[model samples]
Structures are given as C-alpha cells and as structure tokens.
Target: LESANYEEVELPPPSKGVIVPVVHEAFGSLAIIIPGEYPELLDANQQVLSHFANDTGSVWGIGEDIPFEGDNMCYTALPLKEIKRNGNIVVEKIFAGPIMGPSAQLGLSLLVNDIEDGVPRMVFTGEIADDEETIIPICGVDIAAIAAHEQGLPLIGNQPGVDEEVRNTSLAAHLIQTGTL
Candidate 1:
C-alpha cells in the first residue's frame, strides 16, 4: 500500500522548442525528419503525417489534411516504412537557441539539401541572439541521434554516456561519429 502526500506541483506551459529533423524507422531502414525532443509528441506527429501519405507536400508544411503546424518543425516525421521509396527529406543543419517562456526555449535551424552528410557542423550556444534566432551548441551531431535514443527507435549504437563527469556535448559527438546514431 502507498500513502499519498499532498505536494504542490507546477508544470510550466509548453516550451517553444523547434523540432529538428529526427529520422527513426525499423531496424536498418532509413529515418525521416520530424522536430521535437519528447518521444510521445513525436509519435503523435507521425500518426497525423502518415494519414496524408497520398498527397503532394511542401517545405515547412506537408499533407493536405494533416494539420501539423508549429514554429519550425513537428515532433516526428512520416514513418520510414510507410514513406514512398526514395522519398527522403534532408534537414541539413540544426541549432538550439533561447526564447521567451516560463523558462527558455531551444531554437532550431533545419536545412534540406542533397548532400549525403546530415550532421550539423556549427555549434549553437542555446542563447537568444540579436537576430532572434535560436542557437544550439554544435556537438558535431544531428537530431537523429537524440531522437533515436529517446524514442527507443530500433537501430544500432546510440547509447547514453553513463559517465556523468563528461560533458554531454563531447559524449554525444563522440558517440554519433562512432556509429552510435
């Protein structure tokens, strides 16, 4: 049996975080793009985006009926398995910046291109800029790495570094380049 204690808990309103392109599919299959950090929110985005599989799409928006609108990106993308063959969306670069909220928001930069490499080379400091751009520190990684780990997406590598003494940036970059993504 458990006894309940009345504790005042406060959950801040949703933070304005951008969803960088996070691609996770079944094992070995390629991932697509969706933005956000939370796995639950990403899953919901997938379901909605999946419904419009048959429609033509546009950049910054997709699906005729699936209404997934936000500041930059969605929580998830079209499931890799369900997506049309060779239908890949490239989010070239991403950054984390700050915004106004109960706390601070993580801003993002999503770039799509034909380049084979999908990693972000520049570091975003996660701070607000005079340009109002959200900057994230670049640890030489991409959204896929974080998204895959959090979502439990079926893939190889991408294990969280247990060594707390090491900074997350170094750990993430090292792991990602080493096939952890």
Candidate 2:
C-alpha cells in the first residue's frame, strides 16, 4: 500500500450514528462509531460490557444516518510502549501483572463513504505496530461488527482482528441480516 494513496480528508464527526469510547480489557482504549441508533448497546453484554465505558462518560447517539458531504472518518492509534512487539531498551517500562503481554493490541478499521458508486464501504485497517520511527496510517472499521463478534450478538460490520470466532459470528450475522441464510 502506498499509504498516502488512501483517501484523505478531515475527520468527520459521527454523522448518523454514535461514537462510543471503549476500553478493551486486553487492548487499551478506542472508540467505535456506530452508523445508526442503537442505544440498547450501552446495556448489552453486562459482563464484557462492563469492561468498557463510554469515553465521554455518557451515552452518545446521533439518532439517524446523516452522511457528510466531504467529511471522512479515520481511526488513529497510540500504542503503549509495553505493547511494542519488537524492541527494547529493557527496563523501559514495568508492570506487576502477568507481564506476558502488552496492555493492548489494535486493528484500526475504516468506513469509507462515496467511494465507487457512492455506496459506503467498510474496511479493516489491521493490527498496527508501535514504532515511533514510522508513520502509521489512519483507518476505520465497523464498530458494531467488532462488538457483535466479541459479544456473539449481531454481526454489524467487518471483524478485522485475529479472533476467528468473532469473524465467523460476524459473517453469520451479516448473512442472516441480509436474508442470505
């Protein structure tokens, strides 16, 4: 990927859906922008849901799908030093817990609108590495899809991470939602 070849635009606010902030028990913190009204989400999956709280400390809803004329969304990630896959300069950072892994790993996904034929497309950005020396590309993905996969709810969009169960669940949900099954 040319990196720069990807669509570039000012980050748009949640036009139609809500942008929810989430902190994964394993991964650090990130936000998911839903495309439509789904307030029930704040109350779903009590256990896993408990792991995440809205970044704003309140429920955010956009009510309807309002597409922005020239605005686009981008997912940006800032990895914790311990999460850096390869490196060190040891004694750099310390933790008392398991110490077997980094605090978080993320896959920045995207939802591109008005691309070919004017239909919005969902895209997964994939796992990003922490390298202060490199330029990380900004991308976005369907937060609902990830939520559905992880919680075994309805597959809303694309599951871009390494969890096969989540991917399969998402695919099945998509299939059912489209009446293909």
Top candidate, metric TM-score: 1
C-alpha local distance difference test of each model: 0.26, 0.24
lDDT of 2 by residue, 50-117 (tens): 11112311112212122121123322221111211222111111111111111111111222221212
TM-score for candidate 1, residues paired by index: 0.21
Candidate 2 has its poorest 10 consecutive residues by lDDT at 89-98
Per-residue error for 90 in candidate 1, Å, reads 15
TM-score of 2: 0.21
Candidate 2 clashing pairs, residues 3+ apart or interchain = 109-140, 109-141, 110-140, 110-141, 145-157
How far residue 107's Cα lies from its native spot in candidate 1, in Å, is 9.3
